[PDB]
Write a protein that binds this DNA or RNA. Sequence first.
RNA 1: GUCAAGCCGAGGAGA
RNA 2: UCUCCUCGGCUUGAC
Length: 683
Amino acid sequence: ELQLRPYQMEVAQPALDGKNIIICLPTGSGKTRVAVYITKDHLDKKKQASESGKVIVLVNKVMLAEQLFRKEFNPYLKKWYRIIGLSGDTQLKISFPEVVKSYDVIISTAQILENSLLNLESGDDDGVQLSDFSLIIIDECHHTNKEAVYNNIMRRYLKQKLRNNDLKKQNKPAIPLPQILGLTASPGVGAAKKQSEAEKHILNICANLDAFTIKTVKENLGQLKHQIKEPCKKFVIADDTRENPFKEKLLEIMASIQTYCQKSPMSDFGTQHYEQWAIQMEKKAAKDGNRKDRVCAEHLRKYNEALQINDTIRMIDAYSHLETFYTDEKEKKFAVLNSLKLDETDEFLMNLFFDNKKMLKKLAENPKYENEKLIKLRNTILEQFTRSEESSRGIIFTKTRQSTYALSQWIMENAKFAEVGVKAHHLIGAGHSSEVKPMTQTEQKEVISKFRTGEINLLIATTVAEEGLDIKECNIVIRYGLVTNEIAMVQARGRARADESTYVLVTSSGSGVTEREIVNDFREKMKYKAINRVQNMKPEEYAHKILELQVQSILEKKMKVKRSIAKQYNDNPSLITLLCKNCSMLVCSGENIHVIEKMHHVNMTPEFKGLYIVRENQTNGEIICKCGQAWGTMMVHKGLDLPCLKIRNFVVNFKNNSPKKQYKKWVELPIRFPDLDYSEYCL
RNA sequence: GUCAAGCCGAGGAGA
RNA sequence: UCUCCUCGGCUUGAC
Ligand SMILES: Nc1ncnc2c1ncn2[C@@H]1O[C@H](COP(=O)(O)OP(=O)(O)O)[C@@H](O)[C@H]1O
Ligand code: ALF
Ligand SMILES: [Zn+2]
């Protein structure tokens, strides 16, 4: 029951036979269908050729793999060929390399494949080789770039093509290369002011893929334009003259502390540059071993955060955020006391805070000066849903997660949204961060299905949503004051697959966001022109340029290796001393340390044992200092109750000359630690 | 079916 | 070089 459209056939017509190429079309144009048709066509040809038919599909996003398998690939081609869909969530009970020769149609996230190849290179596993496949297919190719995943693969394929070309003039024998396909919407630009630079960027993309041409549709192009609708754009701006009662109270607190510090930011409060200054000051303070400065740097940073959320989010959210933090600090102090101890700074800060904290709590619940951009957002939602009369499938984007969760709660709480019957759910990535609850991959998938069901007419999400999530109908899409690049803008702007679609943006009049909007708009215009230039490029000249770029990429890789051969070759097990960071309290040396899984660094001596504290919530306990610094988390490996930690929380002190430093992660530093022989700790 | 923790890589933004 | 955010992956464990 497979189908096709005219332009679809037109654009793909070359690839139907050889011609490893790219395809560039607007969103929701049946790209997936194009791929599917090509898969079937490709295999049928291999079968009639009595030749092996293997295919593989690649998606950067995990959600996307399931999507394609669920809705497009598995349905049509189920009967003819075997199919299967893999992801981190999926369990490869078999293995990757085996199924490569089992289901004959693979769908996978990228890094899975690369992981397999890399293992093959190591010899640790049988792994897999490109030759095993006959056709490699890709989505969102635009990602292919400097150190992008896809690029890691292509650089291999390119290398082999170069070998094949070398043989072409030396020896008849060669190694087969699978046909490569490319599927995207906006190949994008590398922030090129000049369209010629953009042209170059494209050429780089194509060469990173052995694209013989962009091959965008021209003849039926009008038909496609007619078929496909573009949302009615809409800008929404809001100036923040309010927040004087509450925000200003905060700025007052910040200044009070800075006065406690005698440190001049020379930067506006609530800004990243201000935050960055806080960090470097904190780093310097800690490296110096000095206090009263790094600690305050920490708190101020917390407050700049609180400001930025208070800018977007209401006073309540930020106040709560500060309150949680200080609550944690108090609990640490109490655990330490559990003896007698006193502090001057912390006492200054907590007595500075707790009372003003009550004040801000009182100031927190105010509807009038709650926000401006949030309100505008409400107005847009309420208007559109009221206007749709049950015909609204809504999406939202932001930058962070804490944002998403807050919005979903506040929207559900708001009677106005409740009145219209809108239902809000927040979506995020699997990993846990930003002090938010992680979502199980299944939970995300469930949520997606519920929206596809319409159970949720308003799904909050993050960049993860910007891609894929092919939905039959969506009328509404917005952006909550977030500008990253033209590509993200267009993909998101191309997600309301409805005859009538609305694109909205919400920005502070003060922030130069609409600026960047216009930027990306120009880039969008620039690229289509650049594409038209190359499409008219000479084949041979095109060929020469791409070859040059292919080589360039590879040699670049070689040097990035050369500077990475070792680049920090210290075999110095214990030539150091780790102190606490808040307090300059010695903790351990390098010798008392060992490793498990060659990943986790730990010490397991009673000397380190009788120093920390376990703050409760129960198995995975958290660790803290006697100063109140947090140190690490418990760990139960093979029964051993080893407490593991994070290097970032501690500070370096060499034996030689003590140029104290921070590394933020173990791998960065040169020296090695050993694994732990469990011969120890026996009877 | 549930949860936690940790490590690594990559991209984007800003500086 | 630093920072923030985001994504992907790999391990350990417990329930
Ligand atoms: N032959 C066809 N005729 C009509 N509609 C089609 C055809 N093939 C695909 N589509 C439509 O295209 C949509 C899928 O678009 P897709 O290519 O996945 O989005 P994108 O191009 O942004 O990745 C489906 O909802 C389907 O309705
Ligand atoms: F391939 Al698309 F939006 F164009 F997922
Ligand atoms: Zn300490």
